[PDB]
Design a protein around this ligand. Structure first.
Ligand code: HEM
Ligand SMILES: [Cl-]
Ligand SMILES: [Cl-]
Length: 154
């Protein structure tokens, strides 16, 4: 699909709040992902030893990865649909090395939306959540298209 400039601004206005503390947002989002869909944690050989929420919260390496993930996602969002360059290496690594299905990308999208809804009601009302959903749908659509080009089922 194609987002309007108005929709991109709702996206960027809540992302500006995320950037006050991306490490804290990253922790919340990965922990939510793992709690709501435990099967996703099994894709991280580096983190699947983390047994509880408390262990996850105290993991500096998990925190580090959350900052890496949200900073990569933020760079894609800021391109406002012109994100082919950002998507190529991400798609290749997640298709061929990590083996991450599109359904799992849907799971983390859900986790992102849940955490933004929880932390930022002032910037994440119905219209803004709609715009974020649209942006994440666009991201997943384009990743899916790359997966097909790369030979991966998704
Ligand atoms: C918003 C969606 C996501 C973004 C932007 C993202 C971004 C990244 C980035 C930038 C890296 C490091 C560079 C690389 O290997 O490509 C990475 C690594 C990785 N990601 Fe993703 N990721 C996303 C979703 C997921 C999901 C849903 C899973 C699986 C449940 C996943 C599993 C992994 C794994 C296993 C690694 C290697 C981690 C390690 O052992 O160091 N990612 N991701
Ligand atoms: Cl600001
Ligand atoms: Cl901390």
């Amino acid at each position: 699909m194609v987002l309007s400039e108005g929709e991109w601004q709702l996206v960027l206005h809540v992302w500006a709040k995320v950037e006050a503390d991306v490490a804290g947002h990253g922790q919340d989002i990965l922990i939510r992902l793992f709690k709501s869909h435990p099967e996703t944690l099994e894709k991280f050989d580096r983190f699947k030893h983390l047994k509880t929420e408390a262990e996850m919260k105290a993991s500096e390496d998990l925190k580090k990865h959350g900052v890496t993930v949200l900073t990569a996602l933020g760079a894609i969002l800021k391109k406002k649909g012109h994100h082919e360059a950002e998507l190529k290496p991400l798609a290749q690594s997640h298709a061929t090395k990590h083996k991450i299905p599109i359904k799992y990308l849907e799971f983390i999208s859900e986790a992102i939306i849940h955490v933004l809804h929880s932390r930022h009601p002032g910037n994440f009302g119905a219209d803004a959540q709609g715009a974020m959903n649209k942006a994440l749908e666009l991201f997943r659509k384009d990743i899916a298209a790359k997966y097909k080009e790369l030979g991966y089922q998704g």
